[PDB]
Amino acid sequence: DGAPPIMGSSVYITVELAIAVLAILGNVLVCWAVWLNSNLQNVTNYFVVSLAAADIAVGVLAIPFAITISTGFCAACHGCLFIACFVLVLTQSSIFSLLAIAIDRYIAIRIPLRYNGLVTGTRAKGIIAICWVLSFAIGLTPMLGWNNCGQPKEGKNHSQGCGEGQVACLFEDVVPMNYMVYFNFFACVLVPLLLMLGVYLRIFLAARRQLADLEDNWETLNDNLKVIEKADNAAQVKDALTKMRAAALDAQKADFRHGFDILVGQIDDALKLANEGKVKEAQAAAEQLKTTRNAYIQKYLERARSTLQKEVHAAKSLAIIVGLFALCWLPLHIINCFTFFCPDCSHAPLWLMYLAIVLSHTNSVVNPFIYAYRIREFRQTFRKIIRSHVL
Ligand SMILES: Nc1nc(NCCc2ccc(O)cc2)nc2nc(-c3ccco3)nn12
């Protein structure tokens, strides 16, 4: 006869309430910043709002649900199922939101040309609504028959003094583990994570490929120029210039038409000269190109470089969220795995179970800090609010 469980429950409940406090405050701040700042009103941040909404729900409902379910109190089976699986609904919502963010940034970085023509607030709202609905379908799947209401714990039901029909409300007693591992973890959680990793890999790959392409064009431009200065034949000049022309109109694909028009025009003129056997005429005419480069091309390619740097930094910041999501949630899934795939093992200790539950809950508090740390716009919007209504 050992330590009173309420002593541990005091800690657990206090920790849970603190986590709820932070989860509500941080995410409320996020939503407020997005609502009043017009720079933060794009399709990409609407998913941020949805994620923050799920986190608010965690702080308002899932945590109280966790505190209640932990009691093992007497309630009808299906009611206990809802209480236990509402967090699954929210977690699936978060999954779909993160995956939507990844796909949005992918579409933005590979085809920004037709990004707006494809991605709008209308279709985004339709997506988010469909995502919430499918999250409900997934999370509450157990209530559609895939439960253990038909296999109750006679000993427990009669120990805790429950009514006819009712059952004690614990997780592993009503929520089947094959569902948690196969259906929820392997299919509806792990696979999405693999997909997110793939998409972000493709994002960074495309950013690197574009920077190398523009760099090859820039180097082709200047190297052909140097070749002109060193060449000693009209045909050698025209060869280098034709290839410089190709590189010029290639880098063009990356107000600004003025610069590239001047460059390509100068290249056409140098070509016409070289074709008419006019060598040094071409070498001198192609020497003014560098000015056109020092006034337009360099100024455009540095700006394209900074734009890709910004999108890369944004992709990194948005991927860190998925990282923390995985790190906070996977421990419970691993615990479920070895609660399902090892009958010869000893079950994980109760303190470790609640520790992992608390950990999974902490994910609803990190996102705002990530935003304020990484994203200048979010940071300074939070700053204004913090120095607008309350200090
Ligand atoms: N395995 C598990 N257990 C619990 N709570 C109850 C643990 C327990 C274990 C033994 C016992 O006699 C009474 C209760 N909550 C849990 N939540 C989750 C979870 C949430 C999201 C993914 O897995 N897994 N999970």
- In ligand 1, the atom with minimum distance to the C-alpha of 66 is 15
Resolution of the coordinates in A?
4.2
Question: 132 and 275 in one domain?
Answer: no
Radius of gyration of the chain (CA): 30
User: Do residues 153 and 46 share a domain?
Assistant: yes
* C-alpha–C-alpha distance, residues 379 and 385, integer Å: 10
Per DSSP (E only), the strands in the chain are 74-75, 167-168
Q: Does ligand 1 come within 6 angstroms of the Cβ of 332? A: yes
Ligand 1 closest atom vs CA 332: 23
Q: Which helix (H) or strand (E) holds 357?
A: helix 350-374
Contacts 24+ apart (CB under 8 A), 337-341: 337/181, 337/185, 339/172, 339/177, 340/177, 340/178, 340/180, 340/181, 341/181
65 CB under 6 A from ligand 1? no
Solved using: X-ray
263 and 199 both lie in a single domain? no
Cα–Cα distance between 23 and 1 in angstroms, integer? 37
What is the domain-level CATH number for residue 30? Answer: 1.20.1070.10
Q: What residue numbers bound the domain in which 170 lies?
A: 2-211+303-390
Q: DSSP alpha helices (H): ranges in 121-190?
A: 121-139, 154-159, 171-174, 177-178
Task: Kindly state if the Cβ of 353 falls inside 6 Å of ligand 1.
Answer: yes
Please, how many CA atoms are within 13 Å of residue 17, restricted to the half-sphere of its CB? Answer: 7
**Separation of 348 CA from ligand 1 center, angstroms?**
10
Given CA atoms 254, 255, 260, 261 in this order, what sign does their dihedral have? positive
Question: Which residue from 348, 109, 70 is spatially nearest to 206, judged by alpha carbons?
Answer: 109
> Is 171 close to ligand 1, i.e. is its CB under 6 Å away?
yes
> For residue 58, what are the CA distances in angstroms to 19, 45, 92, 148?
9, 20, 12, 25
Contact 248, 296 (CB under 8 A): no
Which one of 283, 302, 321 terminates a domain? 302
User: Is ligand 1 within 6 A of the CB of residue 174?
Assistant: no
Q: Residue 243 sits in a domain of what CATH number?
A: 1.20.120.10
Whether residue 123 is found in the same domain as residue 188? yes
Measure the CA–CA gap between 264 and 288, rounded to whole angstroms: 12
Name residue, tokens 């994203």: 375
